[PDB]
Design a binder for this molecule. Structure first.
Ligand SMILES: CC(C)C[C@H](N)CO
Length: 330
């Protein structure tokens, strides 16, 4: 089997991407944030505290003839941005882009934190990291990808995120028309439950490439590119007036600037992030200070190749027995 679904930015800055997902019978379509940095499929639901729902589409298990309570199971998750959600669990039929999994754990939110409530465009998350991070207790559950794997033509999914445009998530096949050149594959460590890999270095603009190992995660659920303070300082030093602002929470730059590109290494290959991808616009409406798309990972504890980096590439998440990651230009 295979699946193919379009993913769409939620706003003009590509803050996140939503992908329609069919849950239950008859189908209830919810727009989920596909997150390669977590492993829970959770949704706003008929069980969600009413005051915490504001515009989201909800899953109502009582209206699904295939929903079954997973008796005794609960879940609770906290994300890298400080947001959180929790609730109970149903199993139901879940389809993405024509690919169907039966008996998928669908985690129904009883509570969500304010940042979820305040974003009406995201109806929940679909986790695509390794199932060892799944939070369901007392019986840990599998991700949609892990459940689908055996049915897939090839045990892979691909992320092809757009810059200020829709893109695609494919399951079970590699679309050889979706990238240029060749795909360079690189080793993955699953020890922390993430798609964790080691970049071979970086360049700023037209500068020379610095060969240096940078361990990090391929994370579709993080907006920005978070790298070591040394790397990030070298980037922003090439932008007149750029500075790190503790009041704003990272590097800002004059909105009048033209940003340099940023290149990262994948083995002997190079992925170039155009400067425009690194512009996240005014810090507040009407401000001439703009927020940068490359930020320090110091204090996070891990480097994160988020959407800013991933959208510059066609990315293969290879879930074979020994997992690997592939990157191509596009
Ligand atoms: C591991 C985290 C820092 C990032 C994942 N997207 C979950 O928030």
């Amino acid at each position: 089997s295979t699946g193919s679904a379009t993913t769409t930015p939620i706003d003009s800055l590509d803050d996140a991407y939503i992908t329609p997902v069919q849950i239950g019978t008859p189908a209830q379509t919810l727009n989920l944030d596909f997150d390669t940095g977590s492993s829970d499929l959770w949704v706003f639901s008929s069980e969600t505290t009413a005051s915490e729902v504001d515009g989201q589409t909800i899953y109502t298990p009582s209206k699904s003839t295939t929903a079954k309570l997973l008796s005794g199971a609960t879940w609770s998750i906290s994300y890298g941005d400080g947001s959180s959600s929790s609730g109970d669990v149903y199993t139901d039929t879940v389809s993405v882009g024509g690919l169907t999994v039966t008996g998928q754990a669908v985690e129904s939110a009883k509570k969500v934190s304010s940042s979820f409530t305040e974003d009406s465009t995201i109806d929940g998350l679909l986790g695509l990291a390794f199932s060892t991070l799944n939070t369901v207790s007392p019986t840990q559950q599998k991700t949609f990808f892990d459940n689908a794997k055996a049915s897939l033509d090839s045990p892979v999914f691909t992320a092809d995120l757009g810059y200020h445009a829709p893109g695609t998530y494919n399951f079970g096949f590699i679309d050889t028309t979706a990238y240029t050149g060749s795909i360079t594959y690189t080793a993955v460590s699953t020890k922390q439950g993430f798609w964790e890999w080691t970049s071979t270095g970086y360049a700023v603009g037209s500068g020379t490439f610095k060969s240096t190992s940078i361990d990090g995660i391929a994370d579709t659920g993080t907006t920005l590119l978070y790298l070591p303070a040394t790397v990030v300082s070298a980037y922003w030093a090439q932008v007149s007036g750029a500075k790190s602002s503790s009041s704003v929470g990272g590097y800002v730059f004059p909105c009048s600037a033209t940003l340099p590109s940023f290149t990262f290494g994948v083995g002997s290959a190079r992925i170039v992030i155009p400067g425009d991808y690194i512009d996240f616009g005014p810090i507040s409406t009407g401000s001439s200070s703009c927020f940068g798309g490359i930020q320090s990972s110091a204090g996070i504890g891990i480097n994160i190749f988020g959407d800013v980096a991933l959208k510059a590439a066609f990315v293969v998440f290879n879930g074979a027995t020994t997992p690997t990651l592939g990157f191509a230009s596009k």
